[PDB]
Structure 1
Amino acid sequence: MIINHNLAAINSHRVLKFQNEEVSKNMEKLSSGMRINRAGDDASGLAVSEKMRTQVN
């Protein structure tokens, strides 16, 4: 066996870091309580949101 590099450890760390990334991404929209808070998720939905908010105000 080769010990200088643990490929399984690398894969586990990679999947772990992505998993924690979407955990944070979901938890932040829990925090706002809103479906989208950061751009990129849905620019069209965001823009329609400000349009509707201005309209209702």
Structure 2
Amino acid sequence: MIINHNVSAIFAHRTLKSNDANLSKDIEKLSSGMRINKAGDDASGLAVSEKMRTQIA
């Protein structure tokens, strides 16, 4: 075995890494009660929503 580098640990670190980032956004949307929180969740959806919020006001 090539003990010098842990290739499986490199892969496992990245696979775990993405799930944590995905997990964080799920906690974001359940806490705030809205599907879009920051610029980056949906570029178009924010722009469509804000105009509707202008109409509602």
TM-score by length of 1: 0.87
CA distance in 2, matches of 1:43, 1:29: 16
TM-score normalized with structure 2 length: 0.87
CA distance in 1, matches of 2:15, 2:45: 30
Instruction: Report whether the alignment pairs 1:11 with 2:11.
Output: yes
Structure 1 outlier segments of 4+, above 4 Å: none
Task: State the AA in 1 paired with 2:10.
Answer: I
Number of residue pairs matched by the alignment: 57
| Offset, 1:33 | 1.0
Q: Which runs of 5+ in 2 are unaligned?
A: none
Aligned-residue identity in percent: 72
Unaligned runs of 5+ in 1: none
- Measured against aligned partners, the alpha-carbon deviations of 1:5-53 in whole angstroms (never above 9, x if no partner) come to 1111111011001110110011111111111111122222111111111
